Chains A and B, each alone.
With several copies, the nearest count.
Chain A
Amino acid sequence: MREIVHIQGGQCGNQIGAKFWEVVSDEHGIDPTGTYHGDSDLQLERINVYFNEATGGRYVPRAILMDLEPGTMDSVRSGPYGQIFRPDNFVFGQTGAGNNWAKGHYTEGAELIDSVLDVVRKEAESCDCLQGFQVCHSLGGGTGSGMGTLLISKIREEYPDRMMLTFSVVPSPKVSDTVVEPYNATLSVHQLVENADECMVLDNEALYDICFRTLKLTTPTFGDLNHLISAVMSGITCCLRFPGQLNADLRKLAVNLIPFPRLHFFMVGFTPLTSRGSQQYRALTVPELTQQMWDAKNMMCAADPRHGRYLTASALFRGRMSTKEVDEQMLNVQNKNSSYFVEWIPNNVKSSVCDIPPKGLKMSATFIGNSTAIQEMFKRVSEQFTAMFRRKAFLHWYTGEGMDEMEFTEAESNMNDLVSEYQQYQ
């Protein structure tokens, strides 16, 4: 009916997508072999949003795996639920970028994007009414940010009407995986501010904080982090996939969250997250969900919400719940913290309800908050970018591949003016 295709870029994208597809396949009740074995008939009615029926109850995902090195694809394929991905969708290079935005966006892109575009065009024309594209990647790498970014630009040029989600894992100062993180991130944000429809900003330090303080785990592996991200994505698409009291699709969320076209960078959380012993000590009520959903130590980005103003907010609820309590909680939260909400938009919050909770849970919620506290992150990345670029460090690896300094200057200009507009609206 309404169709979402998935595009996974880089190692981070491939691993997050592997966990996401495991979660979604379990939710729709299909075995790791790929056949359907669900109980309720509610699972069949909306599997087409992610899967395609092949032969006698065999469903394959509508996903495009994409990187430049065999290793991540082999790791994904070896594991369980790795037998459901169609081999024709493994668009795949042989050399490797190496955290080089120029390599992943100008040299290897020019020779891989033909196959990438052919695969995505086939997969987007196979369905009848495409809802939008959903891309998963990180902004620090070369083949994840560069390749995925060029694909985003071409897709926006080709299909300029359909929706677009970008789950982007940005860097944070404390642990910096690559020395060229700001060089990559500034250019990626340059392209995202003009091509992407909406972006969900994920942060590894925030995920570590969640798994350390909240979950109280001992070894919070990337499997756990990717599972949290997959839960967020599934909660985003739950309203499309299942019937609800107050339906809300991706376009509805975008139009109710974005007041101006350049402000489409959201900060995301998920509830409930309780510690392994404190699960029994807590209640399962809408107030208990919202009093953790609005918490600052629960969001999945390194941006304090109380340093700025909530421009808009969105709450997606799951479970047999009461709209009276949902609306009352939203109004009470908005009224108590009267200074963190922008003045010229009454009822900054959009809320929706679905009647199918995640498996094993009675009730759940997801939060998408478009605030003006993300310019903190933008300024923090911009300062490091300017700090290296003023002295021309690590610049030859980009210059000797086709890029000029005008690209860097214009990316800096766009990042700076986006910071300025977030500041003025604050």
Chain B
Amino acid sequence: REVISIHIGQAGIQVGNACWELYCLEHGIQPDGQMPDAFNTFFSETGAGKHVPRCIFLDLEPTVVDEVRTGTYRQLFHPEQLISGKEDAANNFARGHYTIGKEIVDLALDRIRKLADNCTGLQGFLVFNAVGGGTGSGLGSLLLERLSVDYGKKSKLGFTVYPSPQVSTAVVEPYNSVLSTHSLLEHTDVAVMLDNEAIYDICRRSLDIERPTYTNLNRLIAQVISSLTASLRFDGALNVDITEFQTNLVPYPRIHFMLSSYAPIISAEKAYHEQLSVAEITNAAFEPASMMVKCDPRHGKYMACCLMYRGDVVPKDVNASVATIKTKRTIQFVDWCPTGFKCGINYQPPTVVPGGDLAKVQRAVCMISNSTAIGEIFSRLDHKFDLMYAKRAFVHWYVGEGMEEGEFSEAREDLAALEKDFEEVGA
């Protein structure tokens, strides 16, 4: 039951740095690489006394890859799994998609084929990238395209990091995000957005860290991924595999964009102050203040919802909470889906990392829901892509590295068509 993860870009491999530390701590594997068979879905055991992860970090800037190579987990990672180039795409989708992508994707696919060949019960691939950059956008999209054409129907779970509405780090990220989502439409099976200002708000408000960095953000992302694969890793009252999200959250082949949320996210003092029960954690998982995406479903309609429960959870009270949520009309569902819920339960509570900020709890919930506030997000992004595209700014770059105006026009009109798609579906 092995699932393999591929990290594309500087954000992707830092998220990988957090996730793999979490996995080693969960399965009791020392950073040197050996314990002092649940591990089998993430690590493969080589010979005697050594476990190597099933992942590849692929990137173009070598600085962070050599940081990984000379960090603490020097021996945990196989040397060939760490793919590094020599020069960046420099926030250029064209440069990372046509010039250097066509040189690096071949080796990336060559290593992924070996990982899949070693795999036995492959659940699917899952990708970690931020669409705002150049590498993870361009060659991330290229790698997804070729992986889809090579494997066809395997589940490709994309944990994408979209740019925040107001907080930004670049200027060409509208271009990059539009040109990446255009190709993400036809190839990604399940896609989950992750904004940065939402996680910043979560850390500032609930985890009361007044000066957070990317490390805390990656830690929360790793917590989410661990909660989402806990069903495969450990046995529970009602276990779930990765394949079920495709069938239970994607009513139409183009509508795969889901809002991730997690609860509780509490400090070591708020943990002492308040008790955590299934009813209140389910209620809090529906708040806009605990979402991983900066959007409000108050204006949207819940097309579907998936609830993952970890720890001291029984089915009766989760049924009761879901029933009360449905009976109350505070949130409303699309009338073409009265059966809009999917529950799953696992026994193991989430683990705590030394030096972390979360306190250990009895129970936790991860929501992956699908609504139309994502349709609001896409139009909001199209606004600021349109503004800069009106005067053809920064487009001379993309044309020089090898794109043309046809691709820009087709991507923008594809996003407009997706807007009309969402408008009609939400009716």
A interface list, Cβ under 8 A from B: 11, 69-72, 74-75, 78, 94-100, 103, 142, 171, 173-182, 204-205, 208, 211-212, 219-222, 384, 387-388, 391, 393-394, 396-397
Instruction: Give min CB distance, B309 to chain A, whole Å.
Output: 12
Confirm or deny: B83 has a beta carbon within 8 angstroms of a beta carbon on chain A. no
Whether the pair B315, A204 counts as a contact (CB closer than 8 A) is yes
Residues of chain A with a CB closer than 8 A to B239's CB: 11, 71-72, 75
Confirm or deny: B246 has a beta carbon within 8 angstroms of a beta carbon on chain A. yes
Extra contacts besides A98-B247, A219-B314, A220-B314 (4): CB < 8 Å = A78-B235, A173-B339, A205-B319, A387-B336
Whether the pair A69, B241 counts as a contact (CB closer than 8 A) is yes
Which of B235, B251, B316 meets A393, CB within 8 Å? B251
Known: A94-B121, A219-B314, A222-B238. A388 touches B243 (CB 8 A): no
Confirm or deny: B341 has a beta carbon within 8 angstroms of a beta carbon on chain A. yes
Whether the pair B314, A175 counts as a contact (CB closer than 8 A) is no
Whether the pair B338, A177 counts as a contact (CB closer than 8 A) is no
Instruction: Give min CB distance, B43 to chain A, whole Å.
Output: 18
Instruction: Give min CB distance, B331 to chain A, whole Å.
Output: 14
Interface residues of B in 327-376 (CB under 8 A from A): 335-343
Nearest neighbor of B324 in chain A, beta-carbon distance: A174
Which of B243, B316, B319, B339 meets A179, CB within 8 Å? B339
Whether the pair B319, A204 counts as a contact (CB closer than 8 A) is yes
Q: Could you jot down 24 A-B contacts, CB within 8 Å?
A: A11-B239, A69-B241, A70-B1, A71-B232, A96-B241, A97-B243, A98-B246, A99-B244, A99-B247, A99-B248, A176-B338, A178-B244, A178-B342, A179-B248, A179-B304, A179-B339, A179-B342, A180-B247, A181-B339, A208-B316, A212-B316, A219-B314, A393-B337, A396-B252
Considering the chains assembled together, what is the distance between the CA atoms of A396 and B316 in angstroms?
33
Q: 1/0 contact trace for B241-257 toward A, CB 8 Å?
A: 10110111111110000
Considering the chains assembled together, what is the distance between the CA atoms of A79 and B355 in angstroms?
36
Confirm or deny: B237 has a beta carbon within 8 angstroms of a beta carbon on chain A. yes
Whether the pair A182, B339 counts as a contact (CB closer than 8 A) is yes
Interface residues of B in 296-319 (CB under 8 A from A): 304, 314-316, 319
Residues of chain B with a CB closer than 8 A to A96's CB: 123, 241, 243
Residues of chain B with a CB closer than 8 A to A211's CB: 316
Residues of chain A with a CB closer than 8 A to B123's CB: 96
Whether the pair A71, B341 counts as a contact (CB closer than 8 A) is no
Confirm or deny: B326 has a beta carbon within 8 angstroms of a beta carbon on chain A. yes
Whether the pair B323, A174 counts as a contact (CB closer than 8 A) is yes
> By CB atoms of chain A within 10 A, which of B121, B241, B247 has the most?
B247
Whether the pair A219, B316 counts as a contact (CB closer than 8 A) is yes
Confirm or deny: B271 has a beta carbon within 8 angstroms of a beta carbon on chain A. no
Confirm or deny: B403 has a beta carbon within 8 angstroms of a beta carbon on chain A. no
Residues of chain B with a CB closer than 8 A to A78's CB: 235
Q: Give 4 nearest A-B pairs by CB, closest first.
A: A98-B243, A176-B339, A75-B235, A176-B341
Instruction: Give min CB distance, B123 to chain A, whole Å.
Output: 8
Residues of chain B with a CB closer than 8 A to A391's CB: 336
Considering the chains assembled together, what is the distance between the CA atoms of A118 and B189 in angstroms?
36
Considering the chains assembled together, what is the distance between the CA atoms of A379 and B185 in angstroms?
38
Interface size class of B (residues with CB under 8 A): 35 or more
Whether the pair A208, B319 counts as a contact (CB closer than 8 A) is yes
Considering the chains assembled together, what is the distance between the CA atoms of A103 and B336 in angstroms?
23
Considering the chains assembled together, what is the distance between the CA atoms of A180 and B250 in angstroms?
11
Whether the pair A387, B338 counts as a contact (CB closer than 8 A) is yes
Whether the pair A174, B342 counts as a contact (CB closer than 8 A) is no
Whether the pair A98, B315 counts as a contact (CB closer than 8 A) is no
Considering the chains assembled together, what is the distance between the CA atoms of A222 and B304 in angstroms?
25
Whether the pair B241, A388 counts as a contact (CB closer than 8 A) is no
Instruction: Give min CB distance, A314 to chain B, whole Å.
Output: 30
Considering the chains assembled together, what is the distance between the CA atoms of A212 and B317 in angstroms?
10
Whether the pair B322, A396 counts as a contact (CB closer than 8 A) is no
Considering the chains assembled together, what is the distance between the CA atoms of A388 and B338 in angstroms?
9
Interface residues of B in 244-279 (CB under 8 A from A): 244, 246-253
Q: 1/0 contact trace for B121-149 toward A, CB 8 Å?
A: 10100000000000000000000000000
Whether the pair A387, B335 counts as a contact (CB closer than 8 A) is yes
Nearest neighbor of A394 in chain B, beta-carbon distance: B251
Nearest neighbor of B319 in chain A, beta-carbon distance: A175
Residues of chain B with a CB closer than 8 A to A103's CB: 247
Nearest neighbor of A79 in chain B, beta-carbon distance: B235
Nearest neighbor of A12 in chain B, beta-carbon distance: B238
Nearest neighbor of B342 in chain A, beta-carbon distance: A178
Instruction: Give min CB distance, B322 to chain A, whole Å.
Output: 6
Interface residues of B in 161-193 (CB under 8 A from A): none
Nearest neighbor of B340 in chain A, beta-carbon distance: A179
Nearest neighbor of A141 in chain B, beta-carbon distance: B244
Instruction: Give min CB distance, B403 to chain A, whole Å.
Output: 32
Interface residues of B in 77-129 (CB under 8 A from A): 120-121, 123
Considering the chains assembled together, what is the distance between the CA atoms of A72 and B231 in angstroms?
10
Nearest neighbor of B153 in chain A, beta-carbon distance: A95
Considering the chains assembled together, what is the distance between the CA atoms of A221 and B322 in angstroms?
17
Residues of chain A with a CB closer than 8 A to B252's CB: 393, 396
Whether the pair B121, A70 counts as a contact (CB closer than 8 A) is yes
Residues of chain A with a CB closer than 8 A to B337's CB: 179, 388, 393
> By CB atoms of chain A within 10 A, which of B1, B120, B249 has the most?
B1
Considering the chains assembled together, what is the distance between the CA atoms of A331 and B232 in angstroms?
51
Considering the chains assembled together, what is the distance between the CA atoms of A86 and B314 in angstroms?
28
Nearest neighbor of B334 in chain A, beta-carbon distance: A393
Whether the pair B237, A221 counts as a contact (CB closer than 8 A) is yes
Instruction: Give min CB distance, B154 to chain A, whole Å.
Output: 9
Instruction: Give min CB distance, A164 to chain B, whole Å.
Output: 28
Residues of chain A with a CB closer than 8 A to B237's CB: 221-222
Considering the chains assembled together, what is the distance between the CA atoms of A83 and B232 in angstroms?
23
Residues of chain B with a CB closer than 8 A to A11's CB: 238-239
Considering the chains assembled together, what is the distance between the CA atoms of A384 and B316 in angstroms?
24
Considering the chains assembled together, what is the distance between the CA atoms of A142 and B246 in angstroms?
13
Considering the chains assembled together, what is the distance between the CA atoms of A387 and B314 in angstroms?
31
Which of A70, A74, A388 meets B336, CB within 8 Å? A388
Residues of chain B with a CB closer than 8 A to A175's CB: 319, 322-323, 341, 343
Which of B243, B316, B319 meets A174, CB within 8 Å? B319
Residues of chain A with a CB closer than 8 A to B121's CB: 70, 94
Known: A74-B235, A176-B341. A222 touches B315 (CB 8 A): yes
Known: A98-B247, A99-B248. A176 touches B1 (CB 8 A): no
Considering the chains assembled together, what is the distance between the CA atoms of A205 and B336 in angstroms?
23
Residues of chain B with a CB closer than 8 A to A142's CB: 247
Residues of chain B with a CB closer than 8 A to A174's CB: 319, 322-323, 326
Known: A11-B239, A204-B315, A204-B319. A397 touches B340 (CB 8 A): no
Considering the chains assembled together, what is the distance between the CA atoms of A100 and B248 in angstroms?
9
Known: A71-B232, A74-B235, A98-B241. A180 touches B340 (CB 8 A): no
